[PDB]
Write an enzyme that holds these catalytic residues in place. Structure first.
Site, PDB file in Angstrom:
ATOM      1  N   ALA A  11       0.854  -1.186   0.000  1.00  0.00           N
ATOM      2  CA  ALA A  11       0.000   0.000   0.000  1.00  0.00           C
ATOM      3  C   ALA A  11       0.886   1.231   0.000  1.00  0.00           C
ATOM      4  O   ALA A  11       1.849   1.292   0.773  1.00  0.00           O
ATOM      5  CB  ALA A  11      -0.891   0.003   1.244  1.00  0.00           C
ATOM      6  N   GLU A  54      -1.000  -9.745  -0.681  1.00  0.00           N
ATOM      7  CA  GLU A  54      -2.470  -9.767  -0.750  1.00  0.00           C
ATOM      8  C   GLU A  54      -3.037  -9.855  -2.190  1.00  0.00           C
ATOM      9  O   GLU A  54      -4.078 -10.490  -2.433  1.00  0.00           O
ATOM     10  CB  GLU A  54      -3.029  -8.596   0.047  1.00  0.00           C
ATOM     11  CG  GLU A  54      -2.691  -8.689   1.559  1.00  0.00           C
ATOM     12  CD  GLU A  54      -3.107  -7.463   2.294  1.00  0.00           C
ATOM     13  OE1 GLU A  54      -2.459  -6.421   2.074  1.00  0.00           O
ATOM     14  OE2 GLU A  54      -4.078  -7.523   3.076  1.00  0.00           O
TER      15      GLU A  54
END
Lengths: 262, 259, 260
Positions: C64, C111
């Site tokens: 992120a 992820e």
């Protein structure tokens, strides 16, 4: 004497809980459940505690299982004031902080169920695991029957569950059931080192990650409830069976049991 | 000129043998009747403490659904027990332990029989896999939802979507099956595994199995969504042109219309 | 430049995260690019598979975007919040998805791999969920998917330590499908795509919907995990530790946690 069933001590920010019945191979009874359960509750509430390690006193036994003499007395094994925590005050006792089983030796039946209930496991190379309950007319009632296939490949879990035969530390590690195998006698140090790899991390992140990974709502692992319910249902019937008598009677009489299926 | 499956006793074990070796022990209604009936007899016979499932001969455990019977519109399940599913076996829970003794090819339906069994012992020459996707069909006998339950998710998905086979050694390494043994000795190995269970307390074994599979009122309740989704997809798929094109394809590549 | 590129290689759509100078970290621009391409793939019947990879030779996706997080920017597709992180992790499609991990795949990057059907990795690639070291969590599905895809105990070590896993170790556990020679990951991914796209498309698509438990377009079994993740993340983001963690990483120093 008058030593408690379990000791609790602090190594920095890790609480170390030691099952303290080596004269009985660290088998679980109500006294052990009191010691372990209260220490876990303290760990949960003390923000200076960042991780918990569970181990067994001495050099041969982590936990040989449920105490067979207590079973014979038809005696509860759990924390007498906290039945909701289950076996050893541990197997249905969710806490936010990481738990590491430091398996110093034999870890059969109940001992393996303590490992299953822990977040992580480090084992002495000599440790042996397994769920031999089915050889005595009972079952792995402390979570083993439904957790074993959750943590090992299904077919591998089923062989262990139905045969009741033991598993080496190495084989347990290979299947992904324990995390690491260490040199004889070094299991506590190894577990504290693993604890250190977690406690350096952000506490709220570790705590939140645990709650989500286990599906916890209001302190309960939601997904385990049907397993517990089914286990309780089956045990009630089994504890009423003639065969649950024969298993212990036969072992003592040094003869093969003669099962009736009632 | 013989029964679709045989049932015999070996001590306290019932051995159920798929008996269509000329058809590579592929599943039709005749097999499903024999297997299903033998399982239900095993369940209620107190002299039986375990069940072994195997195929006749040295070549095939089970090559899968009988595609000739599939082409020809004939149902494959036990006509009186549709609820037992494929081969009278894959949705036929019993309390007593079941061991697949995989003596050779175990593809599609064959792998689905292994998936449905508690334990699996395999001949070193055995192959597993779910090639239904190559033939315009799906693994409707539990394979589509059970494969990821018994192998790591990514490994399972590769098998499911490529339709490529998995060796006996590879299945064993992943823990999908329990043991690989030397050519020809799979039934004796299964019987040895049966004896490691049958020495134990029967009610203990029986209860452990019910808890481990999440059985209430004789049914694996956690499997119901998978079966329901499989049934709805399969019903829709069998009406597609590709589901006809696949089976028919005269040793040539299929041409998929997505219709 | 767009946050992701999309090209065709035969009947395969290759989606390439396109922020190599930012280690292919995910922001809203990447989510737009990836999410739009996935939905194009879903509806173009000539596309039979999708490969997701990163630009360059260093990173698949380092996670992120931390500057975006510090600004409290939304990281998702502005028009499709329901697709979640990278417009990918909660964006089910019918067609097979293959993550071609060309390098670093940490946090958000792992992820993405978890959200893909299949994963092929460059030998140099590392996986892991180091969010716990930055006072955050793997909010893009990692916290509840990791134990679905690795053995429980192995997963829990990854989750709670935040320490990485080599490509070889991930492959040994079956978290990924294959490890390949440096630089060859895209070719390997295309080869695996071909092993699937020759098969019957209706069969493949139905097999996916059943295997993931898709009802009326929804991967229903993931709902509780998303709901717990979302409720936890919202509470976590308000803590001082959630600001200290990334501040400390930006400042090249050890964090001081307060448990608040």
């Amino acid at each position: 004497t008058d030593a408690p069933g379990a000791l609790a001590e602090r190594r920095g920010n890790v609480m170390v809980i030691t099952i303290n019945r080596p004269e009985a191979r660290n088998a679980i009874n109500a006294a052990v459940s009191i010691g372990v359960g209260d220490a876990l509750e303290e760990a949960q509430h003390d923000p200076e505690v960042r991780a918990v390690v569970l181990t067994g006193a001495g050099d041969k036994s982590f936990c040989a299982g449920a105490d067979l003499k207590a079973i014979a007395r038809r005696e509860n094994l759990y924390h007498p004031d906290h039945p909701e925590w289950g076996f050893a005050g541990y197997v249905r006792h969710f806490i936010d902080k990481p738990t590491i089983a430091a398996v110093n030796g034999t870890a059969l039946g109940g001992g393996t169920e303590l490992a299953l209930a822990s977040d992580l496991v480090v084992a002495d190379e000599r440790a042996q695991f397994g769920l031999p309950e089915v050889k005595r007319g009972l079952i792995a009632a402390a979570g083993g029957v439904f957790r074993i296939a959750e943590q090992l490949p299904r077919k591998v879990a089923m062989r262990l569950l139905l045969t009741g035969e033991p598993l080496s530390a190495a084989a347990a590690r290979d299947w992904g059931l324990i995390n690491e195998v260490v040199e004889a006698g070094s299991v506590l140090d190894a577990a504290l080192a693993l604890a250190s790899a977690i406690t350096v991390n952000a506490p709220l992140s570790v705590q939140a990650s645990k709650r989500i990974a286990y599906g916890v709502d209001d302190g309960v692992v939601v997904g385990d409830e049907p397993g517990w319910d089914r286990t309780m249902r089956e045990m009630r019937a089994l504890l009423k069976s003639e065969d649950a008598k024969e298993g212990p009677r036969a072992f003592a009489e040094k003869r093969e049991p003669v099962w009736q299926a009632r």
